[PDB]
């Protein structure tokens, strides 16, 4: 039962077994061969740069980017045979790391045993079609006399090296060509081959600002990601494509109108389900039903397609062995006649296990690997891990968080302020980013510190149309989740099903076209000329000069911008002393009244009696981020009492809804007695819509009004870092000029109080994070929920006057049976609304 991982060096000879001479799909029929290695069952590795559909100039670093975060370019990566052996030995160690945990051992088992359907929507109904490049590749087998031979091989996954971009990893299905259209068998439930362009050395980076839990000794720090977790992330897409459930529609497009908005690629609904967490209700409950019904129609078509098979093209393939494998893969049943049918009860378990089973957050808890909690957390510049083959840095059982080196606790193995021996910075020669300009003095801002806002057209409007109720209308499940522990329990109970010999007949029938590389390169930087001061001029004025020179602070933002030595600040009394030159007095009173000066100007907390949900209000948000109302220069509390929490937004949204169409009843036939099930479906579908729009309003908040709240916390963290770093340099200049006899003894006490600055700046971020998180909860549960509840109380009295008119029409069938007189008092739950659950739906009874 345990999975085996093979070992080889790149210089090992071809054996026509685990080491072959490949022909990748998109090389069908060109006689171009690359060396491949079988890492395990149905998985191969090709140490080559992904160069399909590309130009040699695409691998060069451009001047600026078109969309997304920073990208690193290097044409010389994976070039020599020493780089390919470095790539081969690293991938073996990452697969051993995944194997040594039962969560990763179950993920590999699902991928290996999910072989794709021989055939698709444009194959023949009576035969298995193992004769397209989308299911078969070729290899060349030499004899002792150097005489080659053409053969084929079946496989599920092939891992290459990275493309022009190194720190982005991809996974992809094979497109087909039919009547001049693109077609993916990995999206119709058939499955196909999934190819990887993986790079293990260059990893992304995140921080620790937003999270609720906070430790005063840990503070705020940045972290880098485990490449093993970056690989399992890349196997679930293969699992999704092997089952043919790749999603591609109901994407989300960002907004590209204002300047403070972020330009990125459209977020797909394939990527939000894989990551997991609270960013999974980003898709509304109504789209998840559309995706569920599509796969059900696809698997139903496969069941009928699999029942009419009689033969194949390869004369040696036993036709009975495969039909038991795909009744096992697709969870099919048999009727009394022998045809395969779809058991919906077994389909719901299988569909939830693939889409909402394996996530990166769940796999990170099982592997003790630290992950970000929000898809919208800040991404920094990527780093590289040069010593993955060093067990003192990374082993196949703990990764970077080794316990024998006190690195497992608090994920210090990934902390960049602690484990400095594990990562190195990338040279700026290949690192390319997208910069925006604010001229007013021109400043450049990256494409990662802005704020992601999407569009309104990207969100479903189906929960607004006409839904027709009948007698045979079923219920929506409203259940789209699956526990990872349940997958591990079922995996241990499995019987070892065996795959057949994966050798077949050569390929003769593909087409060797690769989809063209979509470029991201841009020639020029977008330059914005504005009139007024935005939030980024306020943050730029707080930056300290990178020189040991006299510095002062001022309350004028224009003085700090023009003058080099002057810095903008929003703590009035703190500016009183740092400018005062302490002459003739000890640093005891001078320095202490500078440390705890910042203490009681930073952790400021208040409440507003009009706003009951927010328990902590930080007043100095306004003056530090230029969040001010007309006629409120500094009166941040007075502007909050009038406008409300909407003032913190950079971008006010429309909070209304159009119209929620009444339900209609079309089952007029009362030919059979006790047709009252039509009443039950009308009550059940009434309850569903009240959950649909709710989770469709919970969907727009996560994608438009829960990102400007998060970035106020990031912008507050930078300002608090600018203010603290300024004070810590203000105090060093007066210390070098200080010429006192006690100077040598009080040195440790001076540095002891500079660490007190971070301790109070962290306590301030605790109040700020509670501010922005509760204010984000106060703009949902009140306003637009009360604007969801507003005219959803209208569809109710618009569906009783249709129901009771349907009840009054077929009234002569339900009387004198304790049914009609009962179902008029039953209309009390109709006076009761179904409330909202922000987080957990608690039931104390």
């Amino acid at each position: 039962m345990p999975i085996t991982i093979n070992n080889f060096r790149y210089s090992d000879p071809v054996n026509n077994d685990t080491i072959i001479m490949m022909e990748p799909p998109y090389c069908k029929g060109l006689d171009i061969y690359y060396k491949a290695f079988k890492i395990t069952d149905r998985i191969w590795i090709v140490p080559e740069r992904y160069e399909f559909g590309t130009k040699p100039e695409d691998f060069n670093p451009p001047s600026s980017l078109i969309e997304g975060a920073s990208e690193y370019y290097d044409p010389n990566y994976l070039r020599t045979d020493s780089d390919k052996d470095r790539f081969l030995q690293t991938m073996v160690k990452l697969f051993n790391r995944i194997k040594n945990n039962v969560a990763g051992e179950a993920l590999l088992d699902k991928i290996i045993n999910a072989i794709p359907y021989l055939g698709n929507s444009y194959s023949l109904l009576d035969k298995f079609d193992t004769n397209s490049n989308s299911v078969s590749f070729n290899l060349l087998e030499q004899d002792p006399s150097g005489a080659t031979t053409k053969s084929a091989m079946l496989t599920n996954l092939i891992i290459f090296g990275p493309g022009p971009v190194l720190n982005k990893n991809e996974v992809r299905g094979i497109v087909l060509r039919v009547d001049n259209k693109n077609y993916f068998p990995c999206r119709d439930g058939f499955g196909s081959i999934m190819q990887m362009a993986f790079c293990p050395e260059y990893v992304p980076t995140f921080d620790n600002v937003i999270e609720n839990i906070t430790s005063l000794t840990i503070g705020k720090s940045k972290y880098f990601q485990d490449p093993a977790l970056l690989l399992m992330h890349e196997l679930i897409h293969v699992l999704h494509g092997l089952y043919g459930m790749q999603v591609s529609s109901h994407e989300i497009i960002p907004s590209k109108q204002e300047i403070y908005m972020q330009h990125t690629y459209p977020i797909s609904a394939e990527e939000l389900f894989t990551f997991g967490g609270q960013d999974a209700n980003l898709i509304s409950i109504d789209i998840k039903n559309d995706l569920y019904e599509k796969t059900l129609n696809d698997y139903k078509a496969i069941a009928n397609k699999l029942s009419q098979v009689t033969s194949c093209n390869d004369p040696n393939i036993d036709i009975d062995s495969y039909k038991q494998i795909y009744q096992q893969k697709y969870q099919f049943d048999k009727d009394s006649n022998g045809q395969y049918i779809v058991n919906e009860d077994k389909f719901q378990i299988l569909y939830n296990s693939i889409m909402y089973g394996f996530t990166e957050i769940e796999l990170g808890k099982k592997f003790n690997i630290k992950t970000r909690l929000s898809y919208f957390s800040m991404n920094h510049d990527p780093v590289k891990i040069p010593n993955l083959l060093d067990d003192t840095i990374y082993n196949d059982t703990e990764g970077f968080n080794i316990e024998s080196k006190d690195l497992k606790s608090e994920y210090k193995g990934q902390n960049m302020r602690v484990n400095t021996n594990a990562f190195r910075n990338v040279d700026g020669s290949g690192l390319v980013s997208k910069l925006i300009g604010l001229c007013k003095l021109c400043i450049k801002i990256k494409n990662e510190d802005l704020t992601f806002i999407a569009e309104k057209n990207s969100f479903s409007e189906e929960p607004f149309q006409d839904e027709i109720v009948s007698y045979n209308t079923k219920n929506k499940p409203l259940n789209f989740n699956y526990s990872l522990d349940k997958i591990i329990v079922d995996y241990n109970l499995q019987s070892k099903i065996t795959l057949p010999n994966d050798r077949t007949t050569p390929v003769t029938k593909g087409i060797p076209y690769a989809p063209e590389y979509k470029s991201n390169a841009a020639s020029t930087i977008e330059i914005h000329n504005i009139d007024d001061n935005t939030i980024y001029q306020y943050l730029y004025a707080q930056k300290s000069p990178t020189t040991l020179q006299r510095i002062t602070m001022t309350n004028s933002v224009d003085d700090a911008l023009i003058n080099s030595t002057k810095i903008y600040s929003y703590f009035p009394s703190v500016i009183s002393k740092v400018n005062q030159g302490a002459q003739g007095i000890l640093f005891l009173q001078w320095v202490r009244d500078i440390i705890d000066d910042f203490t009681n100007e930073s952790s400021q907390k208040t409440t507003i009696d009009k706003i009951s949900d927010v328990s902590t209000i930080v007043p100095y948000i306004g003056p530090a981020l230029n969040i001010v109302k007309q006629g409120y220069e500094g009166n941040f509390i007075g502007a909050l009492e009038t406008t409300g929490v909407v003032l913190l937004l950079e971008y006010i949204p429309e909070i209304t809804l159009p119209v929620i169409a009444a339900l209609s009843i079309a089952e007029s036939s009362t030919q059979k007695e006790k047709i009252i099930k039509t009443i039950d479906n009308f009550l059940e579908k009434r309850y569903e819509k009240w959950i649909e729009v709710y989770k469709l309003v919970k969907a727009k908040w996560l994608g438009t009004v829960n990102t400007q709240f998060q970035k106020r916390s990031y912008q507050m963290y930078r300002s608090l870092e600018y203010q603290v770093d300024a004070i810590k340099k203000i105090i060093d200049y007066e210390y070098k000029i200080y010429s006192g006899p006690d100077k040598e003894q009080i040195a440790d006490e001076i540095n002891n109080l500079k660490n007190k600055l971070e301790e109070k700046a962290n306590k301030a971020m605790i109040n700020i994070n509670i501010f922005m998180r509760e204010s984000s909860r106060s703009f949902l549960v009140n306003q637009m929920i009360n604007e969801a509840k507003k005219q959803l109380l209208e569809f109710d009295t618009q569906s009783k006057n249709i129901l009771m008119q349907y009840i009054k029409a077929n009234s002569k069938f339900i009387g004198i049976t304790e049914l009609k007189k009962l179902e008029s008092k039953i209309n009390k739950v109709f006076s009761t609304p179904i409330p909202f659950s922000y987080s957990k739906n608690l039931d104390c009874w």
Partner: antibody
Amino acid sequence: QVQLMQSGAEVQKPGASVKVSCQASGFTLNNYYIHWLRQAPGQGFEWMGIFNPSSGTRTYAQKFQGRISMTADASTTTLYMELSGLTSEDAGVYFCARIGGSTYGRLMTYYFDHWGQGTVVAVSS
Amino acid sequence: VLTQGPVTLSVSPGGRGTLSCRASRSISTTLAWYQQKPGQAPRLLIYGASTRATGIPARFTGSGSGTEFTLTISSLQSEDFAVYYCQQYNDWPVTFGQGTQVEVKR
């Protein structure tokens, strides 16, 4: 009962020193901003200085900057006002005032509700 | 600076008065009102432009538009003969007005 008492000013000479005190009674002192204020023989109100409950934050008005200092002792429930370099424009009655609502968290910005009774600073030749 | 000019104001007992507090754009914060007699400690009348503490009778209240604020009193008595101050802030400290002495019957 809530009370502040102040003591420690009489009649001085130009350029000497004096030190003044403000002892609370009736609440938890270590949770409130406490100001210093004054009034001259004839002119109106003029804020002079505030310190902050953590023996912490403090500013001064422009007319005494670098010439006066504020600090407190969180263990004897007392705050003080240092005067250094006295001239003929510093006479008047001085008050110490705590800000209110600091029971709901000390770091309230802008408030106050209660002074004591005031002692006379007097300077002359 | 906070202007309370003219520094005096007179009204017969039991009528309606106004004391104004003109500021500037370099203010825009909360404002507090304070009744004051020299043989006594100042009394908090209004805080936060509007909020009135318990113990202040139902006569003291006000408003505050743009860069100006005012104090309003109802039913004047003889005990209201005192000096009144408005107290605001800027980006640095506390700032008081020149103060306004209110005469009543004579």
